[PDB]
Amino acid sequence: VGLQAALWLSADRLGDLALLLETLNGSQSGASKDLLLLLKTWSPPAEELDAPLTLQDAQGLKDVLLTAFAYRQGLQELITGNPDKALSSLHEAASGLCPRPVLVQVYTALGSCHRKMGNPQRALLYLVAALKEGSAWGPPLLEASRLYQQLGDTTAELES
């Protein structure tokens, strides 16, 4: 089911996905139309008893799904232009299985969220953190450019 749902989440079938998971947990969780709550509620069943081996387990996939879905949702909420609903899910992304490029992109993404809210000093904080932790530091320099443009500090924008 995890892999299946991974295919659908790679292919953007979120309407069918949440319904599948509604079926998976008790359908009393029917009005819980949110995905990410539903992914957390999803509880793979066993401690995986002495069975044939496998390259990956149900738990390591729930741990991959929570971070993938929360990242993708945070970028959709950003681009659609609601950078207050973002912060919650873009923090729930780092609070999980978050590889070091996924972390770099969450930090840039929160720089963007803060720039849009008009909080340049916080956005500078997250962008310096993204520079530090990352080895892929293009997008951070871009977000700094866009933030100094939004402000006016044009020599800084140009240096970025």
Next chain:
Amino acid sequence: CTVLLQIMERESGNCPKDRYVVCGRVFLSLEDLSTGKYLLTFPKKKPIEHMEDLFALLAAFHKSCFQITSPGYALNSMKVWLLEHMKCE
């Protein structure tokens, strides 16, 4: 027994200030232990509500300290390991 807290200062190379202090005096007997009263005995005696009992296990038990460094992920698994796999209160 009698309990003696000894103290030695380090900065002053005069060896000056050894404020001994005799802090109480401890009696035990087998008649006491036979009625418990001082023992720490495992399970069911879970809900530790005299904090001395907790400081006893941090004193009696063997201690080892590990640094964990993930160079390529983040580290939020620890509380889960601790709370779900180890079922910690």
